[PDB]
Swiss-Prot record:
Belongs to the peptidase A1 family. The active site is at D35, S199. Keywords: Aspartyl protease, Disulfide bond, Hydrolase, Protease, Signal, Zymogen. This is Endothiapepsin. One of its GO terms (molecular function) is aspartic-type endopeptidase activity.
Amino acid sequence: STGSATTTPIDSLDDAYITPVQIGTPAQTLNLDFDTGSSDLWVFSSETTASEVDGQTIYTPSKSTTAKLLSGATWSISYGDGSSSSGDVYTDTVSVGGLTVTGQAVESAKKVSSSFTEDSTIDGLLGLAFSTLNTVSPTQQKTFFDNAKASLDSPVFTADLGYHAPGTYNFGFIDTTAYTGSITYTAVSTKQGFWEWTSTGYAVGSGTFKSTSIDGIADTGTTLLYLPATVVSAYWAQVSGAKSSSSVGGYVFPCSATLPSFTFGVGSARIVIPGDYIDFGPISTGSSSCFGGIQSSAGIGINIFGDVALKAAFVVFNGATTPTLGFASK
Ligand code: NA
């Protein structure tokens, strides 16, 4: 089997991407944030505290003939941005882009933090990291990918995120029409439960490539590119008037600037992030200070190749017995 679904930016900045997901019988379609940095599939639901719901579409298990309470199971998750959610668990039929899993754990939120409530466009998350990170207790649950894997034509999924445009998540196949050149594969460590890999270096604009190992994660659920402070300083030093602002919470730059590209290494291959991808616009409405898309990972404890990096590439998440990542230009 295979599946193929379009993923759409939630706003003009590509802050996140939503993908429609069918849950239950008859189908209830919710728009979920596919997150390769976490391992829970959780939804706004008929159980979510009413004051914490503001515009989201909810899953109502009582209206699904295939829903079953997973008795005694609870979940609770905290993300890198300080957001959180928790609740109970149902199993139900879940389909993505025509690929169906029966018996998928659907984590129903009883509580969500303010950042979720305030984002009316995201109805929940679909985690695509390794199932070792799944938070269901007392019986850990599998991701949608891990449950689908054995049925797929190939044990893979691909992320093809757009810049200010829709893109695609495919399951079970490589679309050889969706990228240019060849795919470079690189080793993955699953020790922390992430798609963790090592970039071979970077360049700023037209500058020379610096060969240096950068360990980080491929995380579709993180907006920005978080890298070591040395790398980030070297990037922003090429932008007149850029500075790190403790009041704003990272590097800002004059909205009048033209940003340089940023290149990262994948083995001997190179992925180029155009400068425009690094502009996250005014820090507040009408400001002439703009927020940067490359930020320091110092204090986060891991480097994160978030959407800024991933949307410059066609990315293969190879879930074979020995997982690997692939990157191609597009
Ligand atoms: Na922000």
